[PDB]
Structure 1
Amino acid sequence: YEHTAVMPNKVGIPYKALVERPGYAPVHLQIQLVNTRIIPSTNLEYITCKYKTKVPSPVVKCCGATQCTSKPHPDYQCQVFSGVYPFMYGGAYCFCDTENTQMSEAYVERSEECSIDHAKAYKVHTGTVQAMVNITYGSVSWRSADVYVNGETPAKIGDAKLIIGPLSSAWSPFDNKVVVYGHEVYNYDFPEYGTGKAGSFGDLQSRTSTSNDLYANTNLKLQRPQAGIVHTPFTQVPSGFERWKKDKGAPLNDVAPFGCSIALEPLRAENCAVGSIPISIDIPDAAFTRISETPTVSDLECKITECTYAFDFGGIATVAYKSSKAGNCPIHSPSGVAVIKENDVTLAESGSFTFHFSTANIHPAFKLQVCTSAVTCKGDCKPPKDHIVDYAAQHTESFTSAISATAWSWIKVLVGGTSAFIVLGLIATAVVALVLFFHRH
């Protein structure tokens, strides 16, 4: 038997319903999401990391001159400094006083840390949505499996076939461009490959951490060696990756709305409480028992003994009943006015049972279904004492949930009196108009 319904996209809050198959006693169904994962499709654009400046041994040509040549090295620099007279530990290196040239060379490489300490720039496109669903029904214990939230792919969970509809909201916390560093994700419109500026995030760009073609854009400039010293001095703009690591700002993990939790393997946003999720579950035919084979419950009377509209199961109610064939009977409240904690109760030939519920209404009025029967529960609920709680609300608050009977009375008096004032004025006007007409005629 296929049961179709819509459940809110909430994690940790179970969805409860009664599967009513004509001719069979209701089967209690409870569906709870363990986690919801939005897994977008990503394409690695390039890898950024701290650069290393490699400086080969300078060519010191004594009593002569050399010329620099271009080489296929990132940000390669070469300059011939004429008129050098370097000294070594063993004395003057060159003989000629000024007819000597030092050719300095330098180029940029990926540092050793780049294997571990690097940021991955990704292009993010719409991917897939998956969830872990926990389901129990009737006398079958809790079973769970990974399912695809697409409304097409069915999943077999404890002999039950579950089809989870697509999320009503296509919202995703990732922009078209994200930067992944360590465990943190940043929404960052990184520069296109080959466009990174010196001292900025993209100063060093590599298509992959093991590529042999490195883009480097730093103001690497060779300076003249100091008089008499064999060395290759250079100036360069400080690594824009280190700078970025200082000014990263808040990661997506700390600013994603709806409480999304960001994970990286694979990149995904977990437990985003957006929209609702249509569902369809085919319960096995063996889980249903014929009506004549289940207990008959009658003479139901529901008394609310205590109630507070707290986020927890603050309500307590006692139901008196008369029945036959003592046995288990499911309990459910079809309306959203109250959420019942217990899923089923044991009924004797006569007596009473109690159940707990959570409600946001100051004057809750809800129907309670006791298998083949139902009763109406009414009462008053006190305000909760705790200002802050560490758990999410079980109930749902409606527009009229907070309006008390006194507030309704005042609204009725307001509208009735105002309307009566206008109505009386109009009636008096009509009466006088008729009197004037009769005066003329």
Structure 2
Amino acid sequence: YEHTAVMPNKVGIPYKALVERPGYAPVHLQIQLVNTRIIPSTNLEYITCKYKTKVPSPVVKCCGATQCTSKPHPDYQCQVFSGVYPFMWGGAYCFCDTENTQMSEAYVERSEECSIDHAKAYKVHTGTVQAMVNITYGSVSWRSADVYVNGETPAKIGDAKLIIGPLSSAWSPFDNKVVVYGHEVYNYDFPEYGTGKAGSFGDLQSRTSTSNDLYANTNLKLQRPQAGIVHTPFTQVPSGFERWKKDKGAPLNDVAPFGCSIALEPLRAENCAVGSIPISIDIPDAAFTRISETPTVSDLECKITECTYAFDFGGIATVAYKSSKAGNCPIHSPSGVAVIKENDVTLAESGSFTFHFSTANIHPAFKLQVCTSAVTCKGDCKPPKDHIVDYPAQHTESFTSAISATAWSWIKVLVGGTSAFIVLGLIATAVVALVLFFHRH
């Protein structure tokens, strides 16, 4: 038997339902989620790290001049300085006074720390969604298996085939372009490998972690060596990756709404709570019993001894039955006013059992069924003493769940008697037309 219904996209809260099959006793079906992963499809554009400009040794022409060729190198710079006349250890180096040439060639490469700390630039394209569901029905125990959240894939868990329906919203926390640095991800824009502003983020872009190609602008500029010493001095703007690591916002795993935990190695977005998930589970008939197998119950009276407003299970009710024989049949509340903590019960010959519930109403008006026989429960509830707790809400909050009986009666005379007061005023007009018409004849 198939069972198709809808489910809120929650992790901790189970989904309790009863399957109504004609000619068979109803069975208890419980669905619980464990994880909920949103996995986009990403492609790496480039990586970024701090640079390191190595300077080769210069040639010191003693009497003459040289030139240089445009060597293929990232941010390669060249100049020629004349009349240097350098001094080394042990006297001067050249002989021609005020007629010399120093090379001073510089070149930019990536650092040796680039294999450890780097930022990877990704482009996010919408991908797949998968989750993990816990399955139990009847007397079969809890078991779990991974499913795929789409509209097509059948997942066989246990003996039943479950199709998890698609999400009701395509909301994803990721932007078009994300950057991954170490443990956390960010929503940051890129210079897109063609640009780089020499001090901001893309002053060293390499297409992969070991690429021979390397784009790097760093505003490198060679300066003149001074006073007769041999060195190559340069001048460049500082690192844009180093500047990014200080002037940096909050990561996406501290900013993302709906409680989206963000993991790394397939770049998922775990345990978001948005939308609804439809289901379709084909329960086998081997877990179904006939009407003659189950014991019928009668003479049901339910009394709520104590109720509390909090979203712990703070409502206790005792109900006395009169069954035909001993047995075990599940209980369930179909309405959304109350959820029920236990599923089955130990029946006897005209006993009484207690069940724990958790509502969000001042006056609950739910009903529950035991061995396909209904009984209505009602009572009053008190507010809880606590202000802040560490566990989420087991129930659900409706529009009319906060209205007490005194305030419900107060609005029943401000729209009940007042709207009926215009009925008195309208019929006085309707009879003054009749009493004036009768004056003529």
TM-score normalised by L of structure 2: 0.98
State the secondary structure of the residue aligned to 1:435.
helix
Which position in structure 1 is the counterpart of 2:303?
303
User: 1: CA distance between counterparts of 2:319 and 2:88?
Assistant: 101
RMSD: 1.2
The answer (yes or no) to whether the contact 1:194–1:205 under 8 Å persists in 2 is no
- In the alignment, is residue 198 of structure 1 matched against residue 206 of structure 2? no
Shift of 1:318: 0.9
Shift of 1:439: 2.9
User: 2: CA distance between counterparts of 1:371 and 1:81?
Assistant: 100
Shift of 1:373: 1.4
User: 1: CA distance between counterparts of 2:396 and 2:122?
Assistant: 39
Shift of 1:84: 1.0
Shift of 1:218: 1.0
State the secondary structure of the residue aligned to 1:192.
coil
Which position in structure 2 is the counterpart of 1:396?
396
In structure 2, the CA distance between the partners of 1:371 and 1:54, relative to structure 1 (3 Å rule), is: farther
User: 2: CA distance between counterparts of 1:309 and 1:204?
Assistant: 59
User: 1: CA distance between counterparts of 2:371 and 2:115?
Assistant: 63
State the secondary structure of the residue aligned to 2:25.
coil
In the TM superposition, structure 1's runs of 4+ consecutive aligned residues that sit over 4 Å from their partners are none
Which position in structure 1 is the counterpart of 2:119?
119
Shift of 1:67: 0.8
The answer (yes or no) to whether the contact 1:124–1:178 under 8 Å persists in 2 is yes
State the secondary structure of the residue aligned to 1:203.
coil
The answer (yes or no) to whether the contact 1:303–1:377 under 8 Å persists in 2 is yes
State the secondary structure of the residue aligned to 1:422.
helix
Q: How many residues align?
A: 441
Shift of 1:369: 1.4
Shift of 1:311: 1.3
Shift of 1:157: 1.4
User: 2: CA distance between counterparts of 1:435 and 1:372?
Assistant: 61
User: 2: CA distance between counterparts of 1:397 and 1:240?
Assistant: 50
Which position in structure 1 is the counterpart of 2:177?
177
- Segments of structure 2 that go 5 or more residues without pairing to the other structure are none
- Correspondence list, 1:322-337, <5 A: 322-337=322-337
State the secondary structure of the residue aligned to 1:378.
coil
Instruction: Pick which of 150-159 and 337-346 moved more.
Output: 150-159
User: 2: CA distance between counterparts of 1:354 and 1:73?
Assistant: 81
Shift of 1:361: 1.2
Shift of 1:61: 1.6
1:226-273 superposed Cα distances (whole Å, 9 cap, x missing partner): 222211111111111111111220111011111101111101111110
Which position in structure 1 is the counterpart of 2:287?
287
User: 1: CA distance between counterparts of 2:168 and 2:371?
Assistant: 32
User: 2: CA distance between counterparts of 1:16 and 1:178?
Assistant: 39
1:360-397 superposed Cα distances (whole Å, 9 cap, x missing partner): 11111111111321211111111121111111101111
User: 1: CA distance between counterparts of 2:440 and 2:88?
Assistant: 133
User: 2: CA distance between counterparts of 1:355 and 1:110?
Assistant: 68
* Structure having the larger proportion of residues in helix: 1
User: 2: CA distance between counterparts of 1:87 and 1:136?
Assistant: 88
Shift of 1:325: 2.6
User: 2: CA distance between counterparts of 1:10 and 1:164?
Assistant: 14
User: 2: CA distance between counterparts of 1:236 and 1:375?
Assistant: 82
* Structure having the larger proportion of residues in strand: 1
The answer (yes or no) to whether the contact 1:17–1:334 under 8 Å persists in 2 is yes
Which position in structure 1 is the counterpart of 2:386?
386
Identical columns (%):
100
User: 2: CA distance between counterparts of 1:393 and 1:267?
Assistant: 29
